[PDB]
From a paper:
Basement membranes are extracellular structures of epithelia and endothelia that have collagen IV scaffolds of triple α-chain helical protomers that associate end-to-end, forming networks. At the C-termini, interactions occur between the trimeric NC1 domains of two protomers, forming a hexamer of these domains reinforced by sulfilimine cross-links. Recent studies in one of our laboratories revealed that the NC1 domains function as recognition modules, directing the selection and assembly of α-chains into protomers and networks.
Numbering used by the authors:
A (entry chain D): 2 to 228
B (entry chain F), F (entry chain B): 3 to 228
C (entry chain E), D (entry chain A), E (entry chain C): 4 to 228
Write the structure that this text describes.
């Protein structure tokens, strides 16, 4: 029998992901990272049911004022979703309508018998689950993100959401009330850094790496469940 | 009972009741967020943190590196969920005792299992997952902004993202100088009700007024495992 | 049973897990980071606030050109500090001289959920019936530093209940390797209130060293028995 | 002699240059833009506040990959408005229906520099000795809209002295082509003060339609003769 | 001829207009305001930086419901200060007790444009060929206070050249009527550089009371002769 | 001359020439804006303030209420107009002296009358008004953002809003730690070229790449009164 501890897994592809062994699916949906309303970012924990919306839309929210008037998609607000590996058109222009379907990551909301946590190494090595815990999946340490106006937020390192299984320099898409989505130059992803186990307490060594050797410098992580 | 604490908010002057199967720990006033040095920080409305037993327009102070602290001695803010009580004709701020009819009430409860929230994104109430029990039905409350457009939101997994009465203006702005008021830039953000067939379609801009607002709001339930 | 929380020493000493709980690992007290001038914090009552490796730059960023940078711009990190004071030149510190300054933490596992309770008065609040006291502390709500960026703690969380009150509970650290206290470094605490005066206009108060804990709300971290 | 300034009608009528000055051109009243959520304004008393062609998106941005985007993200523009009121439905407007809403301006050239003088009282301030009055108005100091971004006018500039007081002197316009008034659109004005009451605590005051101009500071725009 | 500028005493004394210029009025040194958490400043070398009447709340705001509020929310105003020290209790001040802390200013009229010149060294820069010196000072570039909001001065403007260097050149004032210095109140100045190696890594430097002026860039305000 | 000072920017390592009729006062390096304590403050590119004689990555310092000043001892920024010099393939920041080939140069000039800017909002060059003389042609440069998306802009009335050489990346980000680089979030804002035949209709979204950029940029002239 289950116990009431709900968490989420994200495919980061168009494929609906599988719940790890021992856990049961509740429902599936699309990977919902954060919104920007009136230029204020608010995010969802990627390891909770909040990060998995049944319905996709570029505008999942509305706002209301003190005159008792509400507006939906009637101003310049934002929403952000985890993306697939799918490429953007050569023209570099935004996309609208059903052409977005290949771009949005999918998620499964799962229920387990115990709490699921995440563990981080800060090194290239996979961290071990604590004693008495079971491994659910391997991943990379995903800490925070900024996009337009450099607004954004992050994930709790204790949460399964801080451990993405596919590393991507661009893990998310910027979407608008007017119906468009795109990657933009100021879209940033922040990750915990892989560090030298010998070099503690010294000036960090500035480092700039390019495609092909990026995972070389990313902290690793595991999501674990109590037995 | 097993240690899973959550909160219910009346959104009226009435102290709310804990749902069947849960036990009250204490009661207090509905505490949404603060603004210190122009930085918003909020509390999860489904956790004990959103229920303070002692109301005040200034529940906090700040301290510097010269070991000097100040209470209510600068322009900082606090925010509380409000009642349906309307504001005086003059549109001026209120101070002192006259605030009592405006502050929402809360009860901190204890249950045998975790309480989560489920959202539909449609006008229909979502079902609790298999093996879960309904605690209350409500509306999907996601974020909020006020002065300097600062603010934060609720976790959609949390009971706090599911308010039982919908209000265009669910909160009051309060100041260290002792005053509170609704302001033009006070905004509430809610998950939108969507048409089931039109997924991956350009959203249709919509502007609705009093009397037909609840109509475009996403619905939710708070559920506890059995 | 699976309920993980963290304790913070606020000294160079590695803290002890409370009665009935087992240590998972120890590390350094990690409060928050500032990337591209956006603050993001960790809950001080969860394993996230306790990193095994200390560094002034625990993170990196990557762009849409598939290029990543580590400590190659002006980003920040923040850690809870010890009572160690700063060199009188008032200049920043680098390298291994930082060790006496960084607070320490132990990640613990318990049989049940640990919550925090707050009084809003100088009196210690009682644990709800059926709950056990883990430690008593002060109500820590939020914090700002550079650009007045920052975040806070959940009052429900063990993290909102620091055992040692300090006007300056954290250090500002930089990618270039330096750390220091700065004038705009602020700590926010729940205020101690007079019980017989609710719904009355707050009385502005300014207190100095020796007098500070007099106006701080008190708290307890409790676990279900 | 080369001293250029601007006058704003705040109506659909193209304004007249004051006596002794010559028109250079006319256009639409351009207040400020918001790109990537950063406000930048134009001085309302300089030719920059008068754009020949109106559009809801007068600008574009370019990145380091040598790619530029026009009206392809969520950016803003702001224009001084007319007294024309908005539709029943409270929805935004697009297209040609915007005409009746955008204020007109004329760029003028004078023989001397034009300045503004402010009273901080209900009384019109006198031009300094040897200066000539160009127009009367109200002391307009700053403004905020979405994200509470915005900027203001220099009080030394003609731009800080609007001839027609309006609670809502400007319209918020978008790259998607729409414009509207919004609840968080604010206008800031220098306040009319009691002459006896200096270094006294300010008296909080809230006024409604019909009594608003009682509390606004007055101003004159003057040119050297 | 119509070229208006301002001089600031930075004391309780009403300053004198420089040789060849005429006083038009005097007042109090007005730096910037914060409405709805947005800073907007005045150029310290223009008449806007010199307000006839002092108050902690020189402005009001109005919404789209045609409702205006004066001193009825948490807004700010900022003024240049005197060398007057603050009471030992470190608490804010209200009322007429503020009189000894607000700097004074004189608005002057000259025959030609007044500009500022900066050295980036400890040496006083020379006026360009055909220009006359009005005063000597220090290079004042920007400032931040609450929420780290603020703005600065144009280096071309007389306002970027303060005659008296002060680590704390301004006071923070509130709608509720109080003013004080705060820990996060910051002044930014152009730095004095040693002429030999340009394009070389800046040397981090931290100095305290008694030598501060050794590292500040110098400036002169000049008028065309 | 009569006392009207303005600046010209080469946008190259070459010290620019004052336009005919004007006299040089001095020269220096093209200084755009700074970021202290995460607040941007800029200089007008058409005034002497945009031209500093001594380049440095940290032209400023800050002081607190304890009478303590710090120079280059925190994370602050400075921004300068750049040259067409490209960056090393490693994409890493530069320090010290590999820096000179990157900083734009400027000349501060004195004229007999006021120098203004005129903008077309079309691909055509705008004519100087009646009785005014052309100093140079250029492109309409309105604002800029970089780190934290902080930034400011130029006055369209000012010579500074009219850059002679269009660049997607007109400026470099420099730091107190001594480094400089282009970054992804470095943005330049320009007035757009518009279809004359349309006014008051939807803007047509447009995305344009290298080779076709100046096609959509508004044009400008800097003029002086005769
Ligand atoms: Cl929208
Ligand atoms: Cl882009
Ligand atoms: Cl306060
Ligand atoms: Cl209001
Ligand atoms: Cl960094
Ligand atoms: Cl400092
Ligand atoms: Cl746009
Ligand atoms: Cl609205
Ligand atoms: Cl106020
Ligand atoms: Cl302070
Ligand atoms: Cl620095
Ligand atoms: Cl970058």
């Amino acid at each position: 029998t289950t116990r009431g501890f709900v968490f989420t897994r994200h495919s980061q592809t168009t494929a609906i992901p599988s719940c790890p062994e021992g856990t049961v699916p509740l429902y599936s949906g699309f990977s919902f990272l954060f919104v920007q309303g009136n230029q204020r970012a608010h995010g969802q924990d990627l390891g909770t049911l909040g990060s998995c919306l049944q319905r996709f839309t570029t505008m999942p929210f509305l706002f209301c004022n003190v005159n008792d008037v509400c507006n939906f998609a009637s101003r310049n607000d934002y929403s952000y979703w985890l993306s697939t590996p799918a490429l953007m058109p050569m023209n570099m222009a935004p996309i609208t309508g059903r052409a977005l379907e290949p771009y949005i990551s999918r998620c499964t909301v799962c229920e387990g018998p115990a709490i699921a946590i995440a563990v981080h190494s800060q090194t290239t090595d996979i961290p071990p689950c604590p004693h008495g815990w079971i491994s659910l999946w391997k991943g990379f340490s995903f800490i925070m993100f900024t996009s337009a106006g450099s607004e954004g937020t992050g994930q709790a390192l204790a949460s399964p959401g801080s451990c993405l299984e596919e590393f991507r320099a661009s893990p998310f898409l910027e979407c608008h009330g007017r119906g468009t989505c795109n990657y933009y130059s100021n879209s940033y992803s922040f990750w915990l850094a892989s560090l030298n186990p010998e070099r503690m307490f010294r000036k960090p060594i500035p480092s700039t790496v390019k495609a092909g050797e990026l995972e070389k410098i990313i902290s690793r992580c595991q999501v674990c469940m109590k037995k």
